Structures are given as C-alpha cells and as structure tokens.
Amino acid sequence: LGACCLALLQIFRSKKFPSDKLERLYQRYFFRLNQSSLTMLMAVLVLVCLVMLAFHAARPPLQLPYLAVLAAAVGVILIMAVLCNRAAFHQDHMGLACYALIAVVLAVQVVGLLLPQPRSASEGIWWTVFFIYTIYTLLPVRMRAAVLSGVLLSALHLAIALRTNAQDQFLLKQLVSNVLIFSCTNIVGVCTHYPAEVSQRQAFQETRECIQARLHSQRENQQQERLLLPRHVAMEMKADINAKQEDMMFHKIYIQKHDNVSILFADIEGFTSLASQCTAQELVMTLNELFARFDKLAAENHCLRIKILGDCYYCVSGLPEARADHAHCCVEMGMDMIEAISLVREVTGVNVNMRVGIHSGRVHCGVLGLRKWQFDVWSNDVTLANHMEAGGKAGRIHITKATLNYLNGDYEVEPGCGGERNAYLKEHSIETFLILRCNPEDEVDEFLGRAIDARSIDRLRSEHVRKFLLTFREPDLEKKYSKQVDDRFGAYVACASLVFLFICFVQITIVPHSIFMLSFYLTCSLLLTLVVFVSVIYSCVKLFPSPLQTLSRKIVRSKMNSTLVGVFTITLVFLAAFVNMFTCNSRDLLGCLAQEHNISASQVNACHVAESAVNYSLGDEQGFCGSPWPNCNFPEYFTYSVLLSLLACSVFLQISCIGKLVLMLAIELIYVLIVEVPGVTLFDNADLLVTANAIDFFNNGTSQCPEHATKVALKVVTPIIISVFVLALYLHAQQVESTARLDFLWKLQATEEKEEMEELQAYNRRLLHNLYYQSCECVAVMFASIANFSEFYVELEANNEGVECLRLLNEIIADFDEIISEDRFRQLEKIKTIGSTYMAASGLNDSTYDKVGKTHIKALADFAMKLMDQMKYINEHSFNNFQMKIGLNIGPVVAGVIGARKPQYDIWGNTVNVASRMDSTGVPDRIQVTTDMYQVLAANTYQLECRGVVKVKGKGEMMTYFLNGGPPLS
Amino acid sequence: LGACCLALLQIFRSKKFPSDKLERLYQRYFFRLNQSSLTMLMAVLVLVCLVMLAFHAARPPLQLPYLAVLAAAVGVILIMAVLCNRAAFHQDHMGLACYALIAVVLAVQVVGLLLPQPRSASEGIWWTVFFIYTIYTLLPVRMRAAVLSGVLLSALHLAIALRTNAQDQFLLKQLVSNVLIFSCTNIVGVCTHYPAEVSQRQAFQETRECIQARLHSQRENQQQERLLLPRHVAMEMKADINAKQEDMMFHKIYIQKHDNVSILFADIEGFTSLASQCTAQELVMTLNELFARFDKLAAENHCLRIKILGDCYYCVSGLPEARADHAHCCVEMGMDMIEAISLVREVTGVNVNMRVGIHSGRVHCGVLGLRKWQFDVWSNDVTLANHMEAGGKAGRIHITKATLNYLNGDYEVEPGCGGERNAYLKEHSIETFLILRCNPEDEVDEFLGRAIDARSIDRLRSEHVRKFLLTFREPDLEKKYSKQVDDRFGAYVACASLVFLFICFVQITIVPHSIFMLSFYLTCSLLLTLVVFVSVIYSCVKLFPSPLQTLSRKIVRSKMNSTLVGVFTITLVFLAAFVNMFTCNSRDLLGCLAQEHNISASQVNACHVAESAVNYSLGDEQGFCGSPWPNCNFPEYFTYSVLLSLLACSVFLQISCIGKLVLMLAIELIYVLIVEVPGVTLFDNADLLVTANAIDFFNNGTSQCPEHATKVALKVVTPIIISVFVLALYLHAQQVESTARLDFLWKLQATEEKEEMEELQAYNRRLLHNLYYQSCECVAVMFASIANFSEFYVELEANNEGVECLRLLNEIIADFDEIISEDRFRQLEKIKTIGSTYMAASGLNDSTYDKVGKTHIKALADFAMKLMDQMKYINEHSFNNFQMKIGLNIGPVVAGVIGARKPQYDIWGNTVNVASRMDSTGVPDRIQVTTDMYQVLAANTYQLECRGVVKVKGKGEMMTYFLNGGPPLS
C-alpha cells in the first residue's frame, strides 16, 4: 500500500542517460528521426485549428479578436514549421520549438474557451482531448513538461467553464464529467507516453548494448591481431581462410624464394655467464633493451630481423624486397651491433662481446607448421652464415667471399682463417675474411555517430520496408519482427480497465441507473477483469497453477492471441458505450410541442417552446410526452466516450496500423450511423432544448429569442470530430510503427555486423590454431626435436630443393598442432616451432593454471608421450624412422611481448634454457626430464628412469631422468 | 492538305514489335508491371460504380433490374480482380480480361443510360466520360480496340439519348453539346493513349538498344578473350589490373618455379624441303593438321605444349601441376609423335621424320614482356633438352641420364653417343641414351529474361524510389531523371489548344453570344496561339528568327518553363470555363415564383410552378423577373467543361503528380465554391425549371405531380463527381510516374552495367597492350634480336638465377611495346616475343593496311630504326652494350588461330622464315633487309647499304642490304 506508492514515486524520477555526450547523440538521433514527426504534428495541429475555425465561423456573430488570435497562431505555427523544415534549424531548438508550440496551443485554448457562443460546458471538450493526446503522442516533450502542459490545459478549461457557466444547476454533473473526462485524458496519455519514452530509451540502450559488444569483440580481436602479427603473408593467409580450403591433400605452405640476400648472425659471447648471474627480471630487461636497440639498428640499416635464437640476433637484408646494397647493409648492421654491445658492456660492467657472421646468397623465406607461425628463412646459405658466425671472432665481422664480392672492395678485409676455427668452413673450403675497417568509449561513440550519419534514417526506412504495406520486403525480416514479443501488454490492459472504470463512473453519474444498464456493465466488467487476470498471469506466472500459466503464456507469447484479445476488449468497450444508449428516449418532443402550440415546425422557435416550456424542460428525466423511456440530454458525452474509446485504441500501440485503422473506422461508422439514423430525433430535441437553455431566459416581454443556432448541428459536428481523431490516430500509429521498425532495423544491422565480426574473429583464430610483461613462477617447458630430420632434409632438385621435406615437416607439425588442440591439452600452449623443433609450455595462463594440482604438468608429460606416439605413427605411415627427443623442465619464467612494431610473444628464463639443454641432450626416442620434473611426475605415479648426471652448459653437472610411461589409465 | 492526312493514316498502323518471342517478353514485362495497374483500374471502376449506385439509389422508384444488373457487374469485376490478383492467372489472359472488362463496362453503360429517371440528355455524361478516359489511360488495350470501344460507347449514348428524349425542343443543343463533349473525350484519349503507347514502346525499345550494345560489347570481348588466352596466370593478371599498380619501379614479372619436369623438344627433319615445295596454304594446312595431332597426343599424354618453334614442337610434363611420371609422359609423347609423323610421311608421301630430345630437371615457367604474352619455360635444363633434340637421331628418342633415372629402368636404352653429334653435350660430358623399345539474339533474350526475372519490379520500385515523395533516394538519380527531356510537349500543347477550341465551340453553342464573352475568348485564343507558336518553334526551329528560337528552346528545354506554361495554359482554360459563367443571371427565380403564387416556398411544387409556368420557362434567354442578364439553363456543361479541363490535365503527362494534384485540387475547390456559394439560386432555379420540363406536361387536371425530385441535387453531385475524378487522375498520374521511373531505372542499370563492361573491356585490353584463317598477300615482317643477351643472361644466385636478367629483358620489351604503341606505328602489330627476340609485322589488318602506299612498310622500317635508337638509349642508361640485329622482309603469309582449346594467333609462310633468316644473319647494330624490302625502302628515299650475297638455308644465295637510315624528316 505504501511500497507501491514509493515505486510510483521512483517512476517519476525522469530516466536520463548519464553521459551528456551520449544524451546529446541520442537527442541528435531522436530529433533527426522526429523532424518529420514534428512537421506532421504541425500539419495535423493546423488541420484541427482549421476545423475549429470552420465550426465557429459557421455561426455568427464573428468576434474580431477570436479571428485575429487564431490567424496569428496559424501564422506562427506555419513559420515554425518552415524553419524546422529548413535543414539549417538546429535540432537542439526542436525541444524549444515544442515548448513554443505548447505555448501557442495554450493561447489557442484561452480564446478557444472564452469567446465561443453559445456557452456550454460540453463545448470544446473534443478539441481539448485531441490536443492533449497529440501532445502526449506526437509532441516530443519531456515527461515533466507533458504532464505540466496537460494539467495546465485541464485546470484552465475547468476554470473557464466554471467562470462562464456558473449559472447552470446541472453544471456540477457536466463539471464532474468534464473532470472525469480530463482525468481520463490525463491518465491514458501518461500510460501511452511513459511506456514509449521507456521503450525508445530501451531500444536505444539495447542498441548501445549490442554495438558495444560488437566494438568490444572487435577490441578483443584487435590486441589479439596486434600481438599476433609480414603483411603480405598475413593478407594472403586471410584470403585463403576466406577460401575455406577444406579437403586439401596438403596443408598450404607459404614460401617465397628470394635470392641476392645477405644473412647476418650475431651472437653474444659470454652471455651464459651474465644470464647465470642476473635475475630473471634483470636478465629480461637487459635482453629487451639490447634487442630493442638491435631492432632499431636493423630498421635503420634496412635489415629484417627474422628470429632471435637465445642470445643470437639474426637478420637478412634483401627481404622481402631485393636490394643491391644488401651485403653493405648487413656489414654496417654488424658494425653497429658490435658498437652497441660494446656500449652495453661499458654501461652494465659485464664483459660481453659479439661475434658477427655474414654470408651472401639465396634463401627461401616463408612460414611452416600450423600454430605459432613465424617468418623464417631456409637455405644452405643460411647454414653457411651460421657457421660463419660460429667461426667469427668476437668484436669482429666474419664475412664470406660471397659477401666480400657483394662489398665491391669498399671494406678492408684480412684473411679470416675461418677454416681454422670452424669445421664446416674447413670441409667446404669456404674462403673467409674478417673486416678490419671501412577513451575507448569515445571511439565507440564516434563510430556509432558515423554509423548514425551514414545509416540515414529516411533512406533505411524507404529501403528496408515496402512503400504501402509497410511490411518488410523480405519475408524473413517480417518474421523476425513478428517474433519480437511484448511484456507490458498487461499494463496496457490494466490501463484500459482503469479507463473502463472511469467510463462506468461517468455513465453512472450522467445516465440514470437502469437494471439493464447495470447488469450489462457488470457483465462487461467481469469479462474485462477475467481478461486482465489472464494477461497478468503472464507477469505472475509463478503464483498460478500450470494450466493457467500455460494459457497465459500462450496468449502473451502469441501476438495473434494478444491482438485478438485487444480487439475484443475494444469492441466490448464500444458496446458498453452505446448499448445503454439504446435505453435513451426515442419519442419525438418536437411533434409534441407542435401539437401543444399547434404551430408549424419550421415556425417553432425556442420562444414558442418557452411559451409552452411549462410542459417540457431539460430537468425531466421522465420520458417527455408520455414516453416510458427517459431523456438523455447529454449524448455528446457518448461521443466523448467514443473519443475515449478511440484514445483506447492508441493504448494498444502494437495493433497493426492497418488493424488499428480498420478497428477505428468500424467504431466510427457504427457510432455515426447510430447518431444519424436512430438518434436524429434525440439529437434534434437535445439541440433545441440546449439552445433554449443557452438563452439566459429573463424578462422576455416579447418572443424574441437570440435566434441563429449559434452552433453547428451536433449531428454534423460529431462525425467530423470522429474522423479527425481517426486520422490523427492513424498518423500516430504510423509514426509509432515506423519508429519501432527503424529501431529494430538498426538493432538488426548492429547484430548482423556483430555476428559477422564474431565469425571473422573465430575465423582468424581458427587459422592461427590451424610494455606487456608477466612473471610466471611455475611453468613447465617441453622441447621436442626430430633428431634425424637433418638427415632427411636433402636440398636436391628431385625434392624441390627440400620444399617437399618442409611440407612433410609441416604435416609433422600439423599432427602436433592437432594433438595440442585436444581439450585435455587446453592447459598447454605452443610457444613456437624452430626448424624441426616443437616448443610447448604449460602454466602460462591463469585461467588454466591449477595452483594446487599442477595438472598442466601432467598434461605436458602426457602431451610429450602422445607426441612420441604420433612420431611412431608418422614413421609407420610415412615409411620414415624419425627419432624424436623431448626435454622437459619446470620452473619460473618471464613471459612478454617484445617489439612495439612486431610484437612477438615469448618466454625467457633459465627454465627455458635448461629445458632446451634437456632436449639437446635427449636420447633419441626417449623423453629426458629434469630432477624437478622427475619429482613431480614420480609423485604422480609416472614411470621414470634415472638417466644419471649430464653436463649442462652453465649449470655444471645435473641429475637427469627419462620419462618412460604415464600413470596407468584410471 | 493531303500529305498530312496520309501521315495521319500512317499513324493509324498499330505499332507492333516484329518478333512474337520479343513481343511476348515485352507483354510479360508489361503485364507484370501493370498487374497492379489492372487491379487499381478495377478498384477505381468499382468506386465509380458505387458512386452511380448512390446517386440512383438516393431517389426512388428503385427499379429491380437496375439494381440486379449493377450488382452482377460488381460481382464479375470483383471476381476478375481476385483472379488477376492470384499469381497463377496467366498474363496472356489479362488482355482478354481487359476486353471482358470493356464488355462489363458496356453492360454498365446500357443500364446506366436506359433506366435512369428523370430522363435528360445531360444525365450520365460524367460517368461515361470517366469510363472512356479510364479505358484510354488505365485500361491497357490495343489502340484499335480502345478506339472501337470509345466510339461504340459514344454512339450508344447518343442513340439512347435520341430515342428517349426525342420530344425535347432544345434537345439539339444538348445533343450537340453532348456530341462535342464525347468528341473531345475521344480525341484527348487518343492524344493521351497514343504518345504513351509510343513512349512505353520507345522506353522498352531504347532499353533493348543499350542492352544489345552491352551484350554486343561483351560479345566483342568474348571472342577477343577467347583468341587471347594459363587460367591461373590470366586470373592473377586480372586481379593485378584491378589493383591498378600505377607507380611501380618494376613491371610485375609472372614467374613460378617448378622442379621435377620433363622437357621434350621434337623437330621435323627435312621440313625445310617440304616447306620449299608446298604452297603456303598446303603448308599451313599440313602443319595445322600435324600440330593438332600433336596437341591431341600431348593432351592424352598429359604433356603441356609450351611453344612451337618453326617445325619444332616442345612440351613439358609436370607443368603446371607436378607429377611423378613426367619422364614417362614425355617419353611416351615422343613415341606417339614419331608414330604420328611416320603416318604423316606415309599419307603425304613426303619423307619427313622426327628427332626427339628429352631432359628431366627444373624450370622456371611464366610470362615476360608486356605484349603478346606467351607462357614459356627457362632453365639450363631447357637448353640441355634442346641440345638433346639437336643431338638426337631422327625417328629415335634421345634422353639424358636424368630422364633415364626418372624412367626407373622401364625402357631399354642404348648409349646415345650424344657428345659425338652435339658439341654442347660433348663439352658438358652429358651422359646420353637412345630409347630402343619399352542464335546470339536468343542468348540476348535469355539473359534479358533472367534479368527481368531477377530484377523484380515492385522491389526495384520500392528500393530505388522514396515511398511518398517518389523522388529517387539518391539526389544524383533525381538529377539524371530531371535531365530527361520532353519532345512531344508541343504535341500536347497542340492537343490542349484543340481541346480549347472544342470548349469554345461548346460555349458559343450553349451560351448566348456576348461581346464580353467573345472578347474574353478571343484574348484566351490569342494567348494560347502564342504559346502554341512558341512551342512549335521548338519543333520547327529552322523556320523562325533566332530570338524566338532561343525563347522556345529555353522554354521547352526548361522543364520548369514548360511546366509553368502548362500550368498557365490550364489556368487559362479554367478561367475561360467560368468567367463567362459570371455573365449568367443571378436574380432569384424561386423567391419570384413565391411572390407570384403567394404560397410558401415549402408549398411551391412543380404543380404550383405549372400553374404559373406561363411566366417562367427554360426557353427564356432574357433575364427572368426583371434581371438584365440572360438565363443559363444548362450550367452542368460548365461542370463537364471543367471535367474536360481535368482531362486536359491528363494531357500534360509530365506535370509532377503532386503538381498535378495541387492544380487539380485548386480547380476543384474554385469551381465547387463557385457552384455552391454564388450559384445556389441559379442552381435551385434550374432544378425547379428542369423538374417542370421533365414532367411531360399534359392534361394534369389536378395538382398531383409525379413529385419526388427523382434526382440528387446537382450542387451536391458535382463536388462528389469532381473529387472522384481528381482521385482517379491522381492514381493514373501515380501509375504513369511509377512506370516512367521504372523504365528509367532499368535503362540506368543497363547503361551502368554497360559502362562498367566497356571499362572492363578497355581494362583487359590495356593490360594486353601493357577455323579462323586469312591469306595476306603483302605483309612486312621484322625480327629484332638482342645478340649478346645470352652473354648477359647469367643463372647465378647473385642474379636470382637470371630472374633479374628476365626483368631487364622485360623492360627492354616494355620500351619496345611502348614504341610500337605510338600512333605512327598503329599499322604495326607485335606478333610475339621469343626469348630476347621481338617479332613485329605490318599489313596484317585490312583497316590499317595501305594497299597503295604500303605505308605500313615505312612504319615498320621507322619502327626498326626507332628500336635501334631505343637499344642505344637502353645501353646508355643500363650501362650495358646490348647489340641489336634486325631482319626485315616483305611478302605473303597465312595468318590464323591454331588450337580449339588454346587459340594462338600466328602467321606462317616463307616470308616469315626469310625474315627470321635476315635477323639471324643480321650484323650487330645493323638492320638487314631483303632485296624486296630494299626495293621498297629505296623507292622511298631510305638510306640503304648493300650487304651482298648471304647464304640462306632453303633458298641458296640471296642478295641482302643494310638499312642505315630513314628518309629525311619532312
């Protein structure tokens, strides 16, 4: 009883979007959408004003101020409509234009209510109700301003009628009914305005929902794509994914040949000592600073960094665009690298130096494998460049004869004696030289603004809907729109039931109480209450038994059933509006006065009535002239009740505009036929009696009445009023339906582009499956290497110089990328491939890192075993004998992305180096694990064999184990 | 006087498209477009029938047959509208449906004209005029059928009025005026139907124009593309042209590497002897049969033909898709080739044989140059395969050790001793073996039909036009539509002037001659004649002085000015229609009869009038009751005249439907206001007099007249009739505008897709610039070879194995393709490139072959010199010393396209072989010409040097000359 009132007071806090920028953008949309609505509003208000002018002009005396004030109001409204139709009128003033329009309407009301003759409390109700409803429905004003305007118009009408008509004994009945009418009009308009203002905000807010999700999902893809990523390879792959090349006998290799390249390898001499003394953080910081300096020198020297191999930085000049100075570029890069590492030695105090090997030759460059794609280069010339680095001297650039030939002698070189330091350079007798000396929300709002601007509203409306039928041109669009369900239907039914209660109270106050009338109204009330109950069961499903819950859901979930119930409700209200009118008197009073006065009807004036008024007055509820039926002196309130019923058609906003039109035209035709055909005698009697009562009958010594009807025949006025209301309701229904359909259409485009974007994200993510820093204390790392793949890799013409071998390695990596895709390995992430080496780790992602069970370690051991079995399977099916080594270790690492312009995700730390040494020291077809990994796997019933003490570079002697089998399958 | 009548009789031949299939397709379009028009027609005819029913039902006695016949007509029309609204009703019956509708309309007319009471010659004119105009404008019937129906309806009305009203003395005036009205309606309808029936055919015919051009231009591109054309290269190039890679420092090379190929060269031993004995026709026929047989064997043996080199056929197995049996494929191809040439020797009697060389290795395959692109292969392995052919034995397959290794020993081989027969095979110590033993119009109409079906008409209408404004949604679309000009406007002005003349004759026949009336009509006639003159000046510009021609063009070329003139004309016609009505009497006759009989107006009946009928009759043209103004007994013909003016609005078809609506509503409002407000006394007086005259006054012994008005008050009927006409004219204007806009929209899509297709054709042709047989008696042929390019071509890694050399040769060919693009060389066509050899010819195209001056030969010599200068320029800028040889010869050749599945355009004949020997024998940096070319150039003041006698294979000793310089530039 009090909580409901508090909730109602909570409703009266005008909902507003908190952001004034977002509210401004919403207002810009709403004003762009409603500029046409505002101009249609102005045109309909002009039409109604012209109807009032015609009604008042049909009967003199013409008061000059009335005509002048109406003409001025029309002029102002037309000027404002022309300004608002010029595109240069700012939309922020449309709100002011609405308040100005309200003020114009206020002025029209005052002259509308004071001057008209004859004076009556029934005059001008119809146009006041019209203007109220139109301000609630066609005027885009704020809730507080709409309510204030409607209340002001109502109180001013009542006060004027009280001042002008204070002399009528029955004034109170009229006044009460006018109060009741205005109360009804004040209610229904709120119940029409408030849900619409809510659903449009909801439709706008729901749109901002989905669009944000769209942008959010794009935002998630962006950083992905960022950290993910050559643009040509990435765009080719993006085209190929669009090709959806399922059912290919081979995985597409992405290889391009480039010759005339120079390959530089540069290794940090002594780095393992620094990395054995620095912490993981200090080590990664020093490495990232050093490699960012080398990345800069490489960009300045037009050298493409290919990969980092521990301490070794390697880059190629002449990729992807061939260049003639590639050898000079690589030599200068190697010099600047040696200078940069000398500076790093001077700053850090760590005696680091750099060996640089440079070869010049040819390479195939491209990507292999399915996952963790990296751009790499393959050739015998790359192997020679590597041996040239390994045979180089620290602080010196060691170059091949090929490079020297590309240097055109621009650099002083000494014999490098590389074959004294490198076995490969000796066996191949490679002539070698040493160089001596030469806000997201603001972006969302901007994108949405641009889309609102580019998604023009009248064009989208005209494009995605048929011209006249207003159905979507696509049947599927209409089926989607027909699937949109309402939930406030029961609130509209409740409002209609309250309007019914007001109608009942009006009828009980004006119309004498009849047992037939009371029984009929009771029956209609019971039916309406039953329909309200059945509709509310949908809102209160949990409180009612299953069959009623199913019926209520089947009604509200069925737009057809709710539409039928609405139509039935409206038809019942109309029947209640006139079935009692059939109990009004129908005997002719005018022939009766003709018989008493014995005068001709065309000579009967209200004065001849006043001569015999002793016998017949409006105060008689008994059927005059011996009629058994009572007189109904105020039938215009049935018309007003029908106006209320027409207003009730407004409340069912979701009835089709054609369905509304048909229902309203049927109500109009039936009521006009009942007013004209059977009611004409009642109306003529009432018009005559009202005309006599309008005469302030006083000492009329002579039978000189004011004459002139002074009013347009009410039988003629009622149809015109009804037709004008039906027109305005049709235009309102058209605007409402066009608005809901446009909001729906934009919500659909937002959803379709979002679904397309989610598909594209899933697409790019599938192909990938097919400063940011983090310290991770417990990562498990696996290296799995094909030990004899270097024996299988033969660069002969018969083997496409080895490209076919690279295809087979791709398949070997693809199998491994498929295995590592098993849900049981979702805790594992592939880091990279390196030649024939598969690198995986576990525990790098908090969403899969079990702090307690270290399950990711079990998953990594099971993956290593499943890889060994996949290698067996590959050997069996490819007729090869690939022997695989796997090194496992556990421990802390630093993960991060290096390169602001080429973000590479990677992991650094002693744990990775130890894992790589466990792989390098692995026995073929055996899984080598560290002592810590042995301890973890043995604690989990893994079968592990002690390999013994292995000499690990940078660690000395380390105990190592073989993992020979998993725990028994439970 | 007679030639104009003959031209008019030529107009009366109903235009029909000759093809019944094309006419059927047009009818299918027209019926699909007009199915909605036909249903709107049915609805408007129903509306008019309901108006007639209301007018006749407003006054008893109700004759049962009238009601029954109208109800049956309505039923039939509704049934037909429902059938035609079912998609399953065949469109061929719509024409019959129209004739059936005419028959229904005919039935409605008969009962419309016989039964109505009271009888008058003015009754039912309005609905007859409506039905006539609607049949001319909304009924899609053939011209002969429309004319026959309108004439039948007119004659039947006149015959009925003559039979029923033969007793009325003034009948002739009414009958003449009815004749005039119906004459106008018969004319104006033709003048509306005939231009429309013409413009729609024109709009359809003009569309078949542009679409044919589109298809025609596609057709021209098709054979081009056919003869033009690997699909992968062609599609990549097609993508690249879409890239519009302007501003690239290098021309994109299209090279793909393939390893594991087998290369077969097969040369015809002795062919030069046959080619020295056969005629050009017999030679080309024999060659084309032989090479078509080899093309077949190559397709069967999965060997790709790369090129034909004189008598030599060469093909590669393993291209473009690698295959393991490539060596076996090439060996079997060489066997089948040796068998096929043995069979050709047996059939032709010519002792031809074949040498076959097969190597197995690697190739780069691709396209070089800019013009006359051919798929080729480059590698040392191709050169070795060629030397293996040249070192082969005729009738034997000579294979390398590489091929033998790929044959897995499946073939018996002997030592080939290739190094004994080929120097290259000896120097490279290549181990070699010899194998011992193992209708366009119908396509146009179909494409157009498919486009008509896919270009649905109600959807296209709803998509490319705004719902209410009917303006094209894009302003540029509206600007194109606004640029569409009228050309028959002057014919419409002439028709409106003829309608004006008919109106004048009606007014002069019914309305007494007044100096004011005659002067006003004269003034309007002079103004209208001036407007007609100014409009015809547009049609007859040549006959009138320049200022009037400029005014007329500025009016007709300006849709605003022509629209203004149309509006002005219509306003003048309306003024002529009623300004004279202001000279009709205005004193009230009814109050006058009230004064004469001393009875109350409500007691004045036609019997009381007949008591005083002696003083007031319709025969009095002198103002009754002392008015100085004459009586106008038939004011309904002003209404009918206004109907004619509304029909005149139809004639100005191009007035905007909103502009027409506004003009017609202004005409309606003004005329209805003049009928109701000032004329009411005149109309009441006329209704009373006409009611008395309708009574066949006879011995009415008692004042018991037939009573009952029997007619709806004409003041009330006229507004309803006018509003119905305005509605029907609005709907007609809406259908007309929607039709013209749809025809325009399809014409636009046809033109835009045609322009896009012409762009695509120009595009493909630019990239090309960037059995079919012909015997050509006099062709000039040039070969220009870079003599030392084989010394520059180094397949070292430092040169991308020669790809960079192939890029430089591309630029050399690009310069040559640019030079040969000079307009002065438009008589020259590049035939092909062959390695570093540029092949050009002149006189191969009859449109550029100067038969008399042989200018194409001069252009070819000037091209050869310009190439020598371009080679100098290239040498200067590339720091090379490329020496060019050019061989020129003239003589007959056979041109043709060989290969039904790979059409290659080429030229054969002794002239080409001699030109190629002049190039092969050319001195570096010298142009060698034959004696015939020397004779032609010397006759044209070219500077030529005698080289002397050169030994030409197959010709013996031939005199040859050097061309050292061109004729002096004039």
Side-chain angles (χ1 to χ4, degrees), chain A residues 320-517:
Chain A
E321 293 180 10
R323 67 187 298 130
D325 61 329
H326 62 91
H328 300 85
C329 283
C330 280
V331 164
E332 297 280 25
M333 179 61 183
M335 288 295 184
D336 295 352
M337 287 179 90
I338 291 166
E339 186 171 2
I341 202 171
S342 194
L343 185 70
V344 172
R345 172 175 76 191
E346 285 171 21
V347 173
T348 61
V350 187
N351 187 31
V352 292
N353 199 359
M354 183 149 275
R355 292 188 305 278
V356 185
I358 311 179
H359 182 71
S360 308
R362 60 173 179 228
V363 295
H364 297 307
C365 76
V367 182
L368 298 180
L370 295 184
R371 299 180 64 258
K372 307 297 138 180
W373 283 325
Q374 292 172 358
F375 182 79
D376 217 318
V377 295
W378 303 266
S379 176
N380 293 143
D381 290 347
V382 185
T383 304
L384 179 54
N386 184 20
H387 288 105
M388 283 296 296
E389 178 288 310
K393 297 183 186 170
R396 300 295 301 289
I397 308 181
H398 191 215
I399 72 173
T400 63
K401 185 51 159 251
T403 304
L404 181 62
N405 295 346
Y406 290 105
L407 297 175
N408 298 321
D410 289 331
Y411 300 85
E412 293 178 352
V413 301
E414 66 183 2
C417 303
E420 295 176 349
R421 299 184 301 283
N422 195 295
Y424 184 87
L425 300 181
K426 195 183 178 178
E427 183 168 26
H428 293 72
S429 300
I430 305 298
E431 193 189 32
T432 47
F433 302 86
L434 292 161
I435 308 182
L436 284 165
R437 295 184 178 154
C438 190
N439 179 7
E441 299 198 288
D442 283 314
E443 186 186 4
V444 168
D445 282 8
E446 192 186 5
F447 187 103
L448 179 59
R450 294 177 189 186
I452 291 159
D453 274 327
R455 302 172 191 192
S456 51
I457 286 164
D458 299 307
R459 179 175 175 175
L460 264 132
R461 179 189 279 142
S462 76
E463 285 172 340
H464 302 82
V465 185
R466 278 197 184 192
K467 293 188 176 185
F468 295 95
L469 286 148
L470 284 180
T471 64
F472 290 105
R473 292 161 189 172
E474 302 181 350
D476 297 311
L477 289 177
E478 198 71 35
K479 190 178 180 183
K480 290 180 179 180
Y481 183 61
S482 72
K483 290 184 173 193
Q484 197 170 10
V485 183
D486 197 328
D487 304 337
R488 305 180 307 191
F489 178 71
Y492 314 143
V493 182
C495 187
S497 307
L498 174 147
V499 174
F500 163 85
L501 293 174
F502 273 100
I503 289 167
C504 291
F505 295 133
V506 169
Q507 289 290 333
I508 291 165
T509 304
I510 294 296
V511 191
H513 311 160
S514 174
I515 300 175
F516 176 74
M517 170 268 266

Side-chain angles (χ1 to χ4, degrees), chain A residues 239-255:
Chain A
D240 295 308
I241 302 164
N242 280 170
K244 267 190 174 189
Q245 289 180 336
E246 290 168 7
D247 308 336
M248 285 287 189
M249 262 182 277
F250 295 102
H251 292 101
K252 190 185 178 193
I253 63 177
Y254 304 87
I255 304 185

Side-chain angles (χ1 to χ4, degrees), chain A residues 221-222 224-225 228 234-235 237-242 370 373 756-770:
Chain A
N221 178 49
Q222 290 144 23
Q224 298 162 215
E225 179 164 11
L228 131 58
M235 289 291 172
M237 294 178 106
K238 182 173 179 174
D240 295 308
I241 302 164
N242 280 170
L370 295 184
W373 283 325
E756 289 183 352
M757 196 69 57
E758 286 185 351
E759 288 193 351
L760 184 62
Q761 286 190 164
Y763 174 90
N764 285 344
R765 190 174 186 185
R766 288 171 185 179
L767 190 56
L768 188 70
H769 288 316
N770 196 27

